[PDB]
Write an enzyme that holds these catalytic residues in place. Structure first.
Site, PDB file in Angstrom:
ATOM      1  N   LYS A  67      -0.211   4.514 -11.974  1.00 48.48           N
ATOM      2  CA  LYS A  67      -0.008   4.497 -10.530  1.00 48.48           C
ATOM      3  C   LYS A  67       1.420   4.046 -10.218  1.00 48.48           C
ATOM      4  O   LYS A  67       1.899   3.058 -10.777  1.00 48.48           O
ATOM      5  CB  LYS A  67      -1.024   3.556  -9.872  1.00 48.48           C
TER       6      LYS A  67
ATOM      7  N   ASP B  69     -13.055  -0.717   4.020  1.00 52.05           N
ATOM      8  CA  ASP B  69     -12.988   0.736   4.173  1.00 52.05           C
ATOM      9  C   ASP B  69     -13.747   1.444   3.041  1.00 52.05           C
ATOM     10  O   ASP B  69     -13.198   2.300   2.330  1.00 52.05           O
ATOM     11  CB  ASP B  69     -11.521   1.196   4.263  1.00 52.05           C
TER      12      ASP B  69
END
Lengths: 141, 61, 55, 325
Positions: free
Chosen positions: D115, D204
């Site tokens: 990442k 979320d």
RNA sequence: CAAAGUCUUUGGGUUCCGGGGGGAGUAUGGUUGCAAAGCUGAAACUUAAAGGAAUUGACGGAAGGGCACCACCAGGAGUGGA
RNA sequence: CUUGACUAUCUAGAGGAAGUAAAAGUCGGGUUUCCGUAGGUGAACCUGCGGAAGGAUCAUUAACGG
């Protein structure tokens, strides 16, 4: 300020001589410490014997390798790093050879690019480097 | 010595305690001067061993 | 580690020198230096051209 | 790609030293903090501008260089190469909005996922905000993997880079059918209670943050948004995530729930919401440190004179003036 | 700055003291000191500069100021999901 | 010339402690600027004591007598 008597001569002259020693040039010239630590020792040129080829790395901005030669002088036996001038002049100088060394120009400053090198080779085995580069003479051994 | 000076202490008690601190410091600035000459002798010999390199044993071939 | 000795001398194509007619010497040369500078003066508006100036 | 493997490390790290303190870093400062080679780093900078490694800035008085998006990225991979985690590049790349996913391969040939945070205020602050993001994400990734959670395995972190375990699948948003909807549903419902047990709420927890591995195993990624259960609205974020999954399986797969979990368990697990006296040898070390600092300060001042660009600009105009006279 | 003036139109008397920066106010010697130290006090070597005044303001992680629906607010229409 | 004492030099040297190229070899935030002194593990720096500015002055200030 200055004493401006008529009988003040001895004060004046003595003061002048006393102050003369703070001048960097005069002290260098007259103290007899620089004349003794100088490897040449009041000499225009010296003559030494080559010990090794030393490629001194150049002082910061100008990035190159200055081709010097580590001579050991004959007349007293001091070691010196000495810069061999024009390109491909290092190839003429061989280890264990007679070399006439001279100053660089600034009487004890490293000249420009080369750090801690005061001296330049003028002759190899009694023939001049300037001639050998310009292909005017042959080098004996 | 880290003793708080109590009020009831008199001469011989105070006087010996003060003389102890005087002798700690006398031993201490001897030890500080000893280090001051140890560092002075080690800086000066390393100054030579670095200035030795400028002249010789620096380059290439 | 790097460090050739006289690389750039041995890489340059060896151009042979041209054969020109000889130069006049001494008083003869000075004469030619005089007449090239003060005698046959060619007029210019502000003089910005040199002697060797190639373009 | 990475061909150059010596001077490029030292020069680019020297930019990162100036980036943390100041905006655009002058070329005068670089050579002083990269004292290993003197003078010839200015031609390295001219090779760095060929790539997207550094950017030039000559505004009004501000003269120097700043680090780029891609230039900051190369520095992490150069460090990960020395830690023997990354060697060659795998080509399957999921270009996102907050981060980029690059497949990497080690010495073994074992493929891992990398990442790279791409937060996009000047670029100096943007390449500092990505620094704090990776350190925070790696912190949760270590915290959950140790506590039995089905997350990618943390390997190494470098400035903005995070190396994780290669879990290859499809995100839940682009899934047509699941062979066993009920078992997958109960797996997901357990994971909300699991986090609440450790004193965490996802916030979320949607179909946009869940990946299925062969339609058997639910994988959770992306963790900078997480909140404590000490929060006043703790049960609201808990119930919103429940209803999001309840309706999704009813919408996409037409599975209605028999089990309605609304348990508040704080905390039965680890609270992850917090997540002559001097010897001569010493005298030598101390004298050495003094002598190095004296030489390093003098080398800085030698390198500060490199201005070479200022001398080049002054020479061009003087040639024009003399010719016109 | 009314002295820091009466200085190339340079001399009223007189004492101390500086001569590119460092090395270094370091070594060594002497001397004073109970000591800590003080006074006096180098060189080798290294370096193109160390610096003083003034002047615009590239940048402030300055503070303020003002500006814009390619900014927000009050809103309408969406994209992003098929 | 010999004999010792102070010295000055020239030249052999086990060993000591180094340093120097070769080994990618094994592991791994605070600060205005100072000065002198004492202490803090040498220096730095910090602190105590006494100095400096070589540190950015807004505002108020006419009676004072029955």
């Amino acid at each position: 300020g200055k004493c401006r008597g008529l009988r003040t001569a001895r004060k004046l002259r003595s003061h002048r001589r006393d102050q003369k020693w703070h001048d960097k040039q005069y002290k260098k010239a007259h103290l007899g410490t620089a004349l003794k630590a100088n490897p040449f020792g009041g000499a225009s040129h010296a003559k030494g014997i080559v010990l090794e080829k030393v490629g001194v790395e150049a002082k910061q901005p100008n990035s190159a390798i200055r081709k010097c030669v580590r001579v050991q002088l004959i007349k007293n036996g001091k070691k010196i790093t000495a810069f061999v001038p024009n390109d491909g002049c290092l190839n003429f100088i061989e280890e264990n050879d007679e070399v006439l060394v001279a100053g660089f120009g600034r009487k004890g400053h490293a000249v420009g690019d080369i750090p801690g090198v005061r001296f330049k080779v003028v002759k190899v085995a009694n023939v001049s480097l300037l001639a050998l580069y310009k292909g005017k003479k042959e080098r004996p051994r | 010595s880290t003793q708080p000076r109590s009020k009831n202490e008199s001469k011989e008690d105070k006087r010996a305690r003060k003389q102890a601190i005087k002798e700690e410091r006398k031993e201490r600035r001897v030890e500080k001067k000893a280090n001051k000459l140890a560092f002075k002798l080690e800086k000066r010999r390393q100054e030579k061993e670095l200035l030795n390199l400028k002249k010789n044993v620096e380059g290439l071939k | 580690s790097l460090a050739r000795a006289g690389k750039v001398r041995g890489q340059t194509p060896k151009v042979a020198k041209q054969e020109k007619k000889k130069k006049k010497t001494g008083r003869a040369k000075r004469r030619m230096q005089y007449n090239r500078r003060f005698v046959n003066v060619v007029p210019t508006f502000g003089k910005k051209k040199g002697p060797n100036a190639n373009s | 790609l990475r061909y150059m493997s010596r001077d490029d490390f030292r020069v680019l790290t020297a930019v990162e030293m100036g980036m943390k303190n100041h905006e655009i870093v002058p070329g005068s400062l670089i050579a002083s903090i990269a004292s290993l080679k003197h003078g010839g780093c200015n031609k390295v900078l001219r090779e760095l501008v060929k790539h997207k490694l550094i950017a030039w800035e000559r505004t009004k008085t501000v003269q120097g260089y700043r680090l780029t998006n891609a230039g900051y990225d190369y520095l992490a991979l150069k460090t990960l190469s020395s830690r023997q985690v990354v060697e060659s590049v795998g080509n399957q790349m999921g270009v996102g909005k907050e981060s980029d996913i690059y497949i990497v391969a080690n010495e073994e040939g074992q493929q891992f996922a990398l990442k790279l945070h791409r937060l996009g205020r000047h670029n100096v602050s943007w390449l500092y905000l990505s620094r704090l993001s990776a350190m925070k994400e790696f912190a949760y990734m270590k915290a959950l993997y140790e506590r039995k959670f089905p997350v990618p395995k943390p390997i190494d972190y470098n400035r903005h880079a995070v190396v994780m375990e290669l879990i290859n699948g499809y995100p839940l948003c682009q899934i047509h059918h699941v062979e066993d909807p009920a078992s997958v549903y109960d797996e997901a419902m357990e994971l909300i209670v699991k986090l609440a047990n450790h004193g965490l709420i996802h916030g979320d927890f949607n179909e946009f943050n869940l990946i299925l591995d062969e339609s058997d195993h639910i994988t959770m990624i992306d963790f900078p948004q997480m909140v404590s259960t000490s929060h006043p609205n703790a049960e609201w974020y808990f119930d919103r995530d429940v209803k999001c999954i309840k309706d999704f399986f009813m919408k996409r797969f037409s599975y209605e729930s028999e089990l309605f979990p609304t348990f508040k368990d704080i905390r039965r697990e680890d609270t992850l919401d917090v997540e002559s006296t001097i010897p001569p040898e010493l005298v030598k070390q101390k004298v050495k440190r003094q002598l190095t600092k004296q030489q390093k300060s003098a080398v800085r001042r030698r390198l500060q004179k490199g201005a070479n660009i200022f001398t080049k600009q002054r020479r061009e105009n003087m040639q024009n003036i003399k010719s016109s006279l």
